[PDB]
């Protein structure tokens, strides 16, 4: 029912690692500062995502057992989770409490960023759905670790080796849900269900980027490796 010493150690270690991320307030201030053109917004997106992927590699390498995995499987896990991890992190940032009216302004600024309307609604539907779950920092950090260590990813040669790394994290998350949300026993299943919605954004990320209302879609060599873009 309660966490074991090994589990508390693992949880705290995932937490230290996750807290190395850029401050949510730092991100929201850049957006809420002034209304930018779609071109200035796309540039912010590419800068944010470049730093996100760099921080994600460092968090990923600290995941227990990750360094023991085959080098090609390591690349496949990272390439398959980078997009999902940024969307998951964007939902966390979105749902952080701000002074009255600022969350309405942040929503409107994102809606007017340059992204197509066809992608706006499923994006806000996912953020809204995440916010309803009232997730703690521990839950976001574990769910990010679980997303990275998904054996059910394409191009994985040794699925068993990855499943062995994902199981203890699934075990910790399941325990946290039974403790912080005892009135809702379906909470862990709800969280796991969100990961299927995450996968849809990954399937449409290239079209989302190319449909952005800018004259030129300029990327960095690192973003070309993580996104399916030229």
């Amino acid at each position: 029912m309660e966490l074991t010493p090994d589990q508390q150690t693992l949880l705290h270690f995932i937490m230290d690692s996750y807290n190395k991320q850029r401050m949510p307030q730092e991100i929201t201030n850049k957006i809420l500062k002034e209304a930018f053109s779609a071109e200035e917004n796309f540039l912010i997106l590419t800068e944010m995502a470049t730093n996100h992927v760099q921080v994600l590699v460092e968090f990923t390498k600290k995941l227990p057992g990750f360094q023991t995995l085959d080098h090609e499987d390591q690349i496949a896990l990272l390439k398959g989770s980078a997009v999902e991890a940024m969307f998951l992190r964007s939902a966390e940032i979105f749902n952080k409490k701000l002074p009255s009216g600022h969350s309405d302004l942040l929503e409107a600024r994102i809606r007017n960023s340059g992204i197509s309307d066809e992608y706006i609604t499923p994006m806000f539907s996912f953020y809204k759905s995440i916010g309803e779950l009232k997730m703690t920092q521990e839950e976001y950090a574990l769910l990010t670790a679980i997303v990275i260590l998904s054996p059910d990813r394409q191009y994985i040669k040794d699925r068993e080796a990855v499943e062995k790394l994902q199981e203890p994290l699934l075990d910790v998350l399941q325990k946290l849900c039974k403790i912080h949300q005892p009135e809702n026993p379906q909470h862990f299943a709800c969280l796991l269900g969100r990961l299927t919605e995450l996968r849809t954004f990954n399937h449409h990320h290239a079209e989302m980027l190319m449909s952005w209302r800018v004259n030129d879609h300029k990327f960095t060599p690192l973003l070309c490796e993580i996104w399916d873009v030229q």
Partner: peptide, 12 residues
């Protein structure tokens, strides 16, 4: 090819 990812994952 994933030269940069390969680099970020192998260095210390």
């Amino acid at each position: 090819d994933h030269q940069l990812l390969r680099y970020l994952l192998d260095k210390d």
